Scaffold this active site. Structure first.
Site, short mmCIF file in Angstrom:
data_model
loop_
_atom_site.label_atom_id
_atom_site.label_comp_id
_atom_site.label_asym_id
_atom_site.label_seq_id
_atom_site.Cartn_x
_atom_site.Cartn_y
_atom_site.Cartn_z
N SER A 45 0.78 -1.23 0.00
CA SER A 45 0.00 0.00 0.00
C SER A 45 0.81 1.27 0.00
O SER A 45 0.25 2.36 -0.15
CB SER A 45 -0.99 0.03 1.17
N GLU A 143 -4.31 -7.45 -5.76
CA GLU A 143 -3.29 -8.36 -6.25
C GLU A 143 -1.84 -7.97 -6.08
O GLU A 143 -0.98 -8.83 -6.01
CB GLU A 143 -3.55 -8.69 -7.74
C1 LIG Z 1 -1.81 -2.13 1.65
O1 LIG Z 1 -0.68 -2.51 1.97
C2 LIG Z 1 -2.86 -3.04 1.73
C3 LIG Z 1 -2.57 -4.34 2.11
N1 LIG Z 1 -3.52 -5.25 2.20
C4 LIG Z 1 -3.18 -6.62 2.60
C5 LIG Z 1 -3.23 -6.75 4.10
O2 LIG Z 1 -3.48 -5.76 4.80
C6 LIG Z 1 -2.99 -8.11 4.74
C7 LIG Z 1 -1.73 -8.09 5.61
O3 LIG Z 1 -1.55 -9.37 6.22
#
Ligand SMILES: *C(=O)/C=C/NCC(O)CC=O
Ligand SMILES: OC[C@H]1O[C@H](O[C@H]2[C@H](O)[C@@H](O)[C@H](OCCCCCCC3CCCCC3)O[C@@H]2CO)[C@H](O)[C@@H](O)[C@@H]1O
Length: 265
Positions: A45, A143
């Site tokens: 993210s 993804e």
């Molecule tokens: C931004 O990094 C969003 C990530 N999403 C996946 C998760 O938060 C799962 C982490 O174990």
């Protein structure tokens, strides 16, 4: 705490994972601490800050408006959309979408914005335009966090990400208002900002965007400094560790503790 580099090494040893880190002076770009700075790590993210930098560049050029309302549909939503799922009827402005992507890690907001800049390929082209020839986005919001071993997709390096963040926040590639906006979105992070402040000694500034992925991937891009100033960019990525989220959070906090205790370098 031990010296920064010693603590970073201890973190790898304890996590049985790779850590990548850069500590950079925001004003000059001087690299202070570096570890596996040229190695690849999934951005997760944290890519959302670069994404909104690309959006702001379009606004500056007259090709976008933060006020522009985007109406989207329920079928457009992906996993974890705390803000965007609430506006199917009234929509959200481009600026609101950036605030949701950066301050709440809203994935649908990130995807809606990503399309406006030409998708993963368009964001990658924006990175090449500002001189980052390493960072690359290949997939969409959900993804891109897969973090498959040896997969170069959706990766950056600590050194490239720090340099790119400095370019977006201070190089005047973005207008003054846009540089201020990008910084304020990081200052307003709701996911980790308040938590970090709860453990930071009085007097320390924090602005940040965090991320998490598979196989222990975890990361944070941040501005940190004493005397309530954003003195340095700190980028820390973790990958390929089977450790619990709590221990990955604690190890990152530990590296921060080392930097704080031994700040003068
Ligand atoms: C931004 O990094 C969003 C990530 N999403 C996946 C998760 O938060 C799962 C982490 O174990
Ligand atoms: O002597 C220095 C300081 O030592 C302690 O502070 C501790 C603090 O009580 C603890 O909670 C934190 O944990 C580290 C918290 C790190 C928070 C996030 C760091 C992020 C920010 C930037 C990107 C990477 C990591 O360490 C410091 C330094 O030992 C004292 O509590 C404090 O009064 C004193 O000023």
């Amino acid at each position: 705490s031990p010296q920064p580099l010693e603590q970073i090494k201890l973190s790898e040893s304890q996590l049985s994972g790779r850590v990548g880190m850069i500590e950079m002076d925001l004003a000059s770009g001087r690299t202070l601490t570096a570890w596996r700075a040229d190695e690849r790590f999934p951005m997760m993210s944290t890519f959302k800050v670069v994404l909104c930098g690309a959006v702001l560049a379009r606004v500056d050029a007259g090709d976008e408006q933060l006020e522009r309302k985007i109406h989207y549909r329920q079928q457009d939503l992906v996993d974890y959309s705390p803000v965007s799922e609430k506006h199917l009827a009234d929509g959200m402005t481009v600026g609101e979408l950036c605030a949701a992507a950066i301050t709440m890690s809203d994935n649908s907001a990130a995807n809606l914005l990503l399309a406006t800049v030409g998708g993963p390929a368009g964001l990658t082209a924006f990175l090449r335009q500002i001189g980052d020839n390493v960072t690359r986005l290949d997939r969409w919001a959900t993804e891109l966090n897969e973090a498959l071993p040896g997969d170069a997709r959706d990766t950056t390096t600590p050194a490239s990400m720090a340099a790119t963040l400095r370019k977006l926040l201070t190089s005047q590639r973005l207008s003054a208002r846009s540089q201020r906006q990008l910084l304020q979105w990081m200052v307003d992070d709701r996911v980790a900002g308040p938590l970090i402040r709860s453990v930071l000694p009085a007097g320390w500034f924090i602005a940040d965007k965090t991320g998490a992925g598979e196989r222990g991937a975890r990361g944070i891009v941040a501005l940190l400094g004493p005397n309530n100033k954003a003195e340095r960019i700190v980028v820390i990525y973790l990958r390929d560790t089977p450790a619990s989220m709590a221990e990955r959070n604690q190890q990152i906090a530990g590296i921060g503790a080392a930097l704080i205790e031994h700040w003068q370098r």
